[PDB]
Design a protein around this ligand. Structure first.
Ligand code: 3KT
Length: 387
């Protein structure tokens, strides 16, 4: 329906993350927390760090409970270490409830905090299977559902501005919505289409076909999900398995061949700039990902524009971007730049993820993002990778 209290409760951007305000402890300690659908721990800065202007102070909370256990979490881009405990947690622009949740108090980290991101912790919204140190550490959303009458579903509208936001602008700007326990109809246009959650660990999905400007990439669909495909708000880019990335970049280069870009642009390292207002969107192709539907032999597609996969960056008055599609050795990752095109419903109760065109997606007068279906698609279970 309508969830006014939660609409516009996010801030941030694809490159540094989208975050929501939360409170921890008694009296409440306010912290900004990264919304991360790609992990399952609630972990917050709990000791001084050069990039933090506030942190969780356990000694000032009367409701803090020490679990007397450490946690070490190495990830490819960095690491975080901490001390486990529980405390009372609330979301001010959320459901009007307080829950007792697990909190990892971060004591040491490497490439975790981002200078100028304005967040002090992460909210891992995925399932207990990938919680650290193990699946006995109940994730936040599981605690929320178990302790309250909040429905077992949340939905995300991540709003890319379509241009760079300076330090002051990114702090003052509305970055989107996290609707806890429901679907807000004002955040999308058209219909919601659902794909099954293949397995409850990451938010795993199955891609069954890929097109670049309607041209089929024509790879064995297992390649698209090798070794998994996930929906992850805590990754910036659309990341594709090595072989898929090579074929997709070849096709995107061919479609955009009226302009030549340096190798560093395609590697997602170097920015490209155009005179103010002259970005040649029309030379870049749309990308369609077909996802398994809820009905046997049925799929649907989500279509993104270059306004999603070209990420705005500051250089001058030029309009500059980085290519936000990159290679992966751990499967497809539908990151924040893809999520910015859509309202995404994480329907845990019905083991499915919904997509609809976002009411805040960036587009031009000639093209828009799309969510369309149905399409007849056979042997879709064969697209899933095993082992
Ligand atoms: C890709 N990915 C995530 N989605 N979460 C983590 C942990 C994954 C866990 C590791 C343990 C196993 C299960 C998966 C850490 C998180 C830390 C803070 C920074 C953030 N990325 C920034 C924020 C926005 C863009 C880039 C990454 C990660 O590596």
């Amino acid at each position: 329906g309508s969830f006014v209290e939660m609409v516009d409760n996010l801030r941030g951007k694809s490159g540094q993350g989208y975050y929501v305000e939360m409170t921890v402890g008694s009296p409440p300690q306010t912290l900004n927390i990264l919304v991360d659908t790609g992990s399952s721990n609630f972990a917050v800065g709990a000791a001084p760090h050069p990039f933090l202007h506030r942190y969780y102070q356990r000694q000032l909370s009367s409701t803090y409970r020490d679990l007397r256990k450490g946690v070490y979490v190495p990830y490819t881009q960095g690491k975080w270490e901490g001390e486990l405990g529980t405390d009372l947690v609330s979301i001010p622009h959320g459901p009007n409830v307080t829950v007792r949740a697990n909190i990892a108090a971060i004591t040491e980290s490497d490439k975790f905090f981002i200078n100028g991101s304005n967040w002090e912790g992460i909210l891992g919204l995925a399932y207990a299977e990938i919680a650290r140190p193990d699946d006995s550490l109940e994730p936040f959303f599981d605690s929320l559902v178990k302790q309250t009458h909040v429905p077992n579903l949340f939905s995300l509208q991540l709003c890319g501005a379509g241009f760079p936001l300076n330090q002051s602008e990114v702090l003052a700007s509305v970055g989107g919505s996290m609707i806890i326990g429901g679907i807000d109809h004002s955040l999308y246009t058209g219909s919601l289409w659902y794909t099954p959650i293949r397995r409850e660990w990451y938010y795993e999905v199955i891609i069954v076909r890929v097109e670049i400007n309607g041209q089929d990439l024509k790879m064995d669909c297992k390649e698209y999900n090798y070794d998994k495909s996930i929906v992850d708000s805590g990754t910036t880019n659309l990341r594709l398995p090595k072989k898929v990335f090579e074929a997709a970049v070849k096709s995107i280069k061919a479609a955009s061949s009226t302009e030549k870009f340096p190798d560093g642009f395609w590697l997602g390292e170097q920015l490209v700039c155009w005179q103010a207002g002259t970005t040649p969107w029309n030379i870049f192709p749309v990308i369609s990902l077909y996802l398994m539907g809820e009905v046997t032999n049925q799929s649907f597609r989500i279509t993104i524009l270059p306004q999603q996969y070209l990420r705005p960056v500051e250089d001058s008055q030029d309009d500059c971007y980085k290519f936000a599609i990159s290679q992966s050795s751990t499967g497809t990752v539908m990151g924040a730049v893809i999520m910015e095109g859509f309202y995404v419903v994480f329907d845990r109760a019905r083991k499915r993820i919904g997509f609809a065109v976002s009411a805040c997606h960036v587009h031009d007068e000639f093209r828009t993002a799309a969510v369309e279906g149905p399409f007849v698609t056979l042997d879709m279970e064969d697209c899933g990778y095993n082992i």
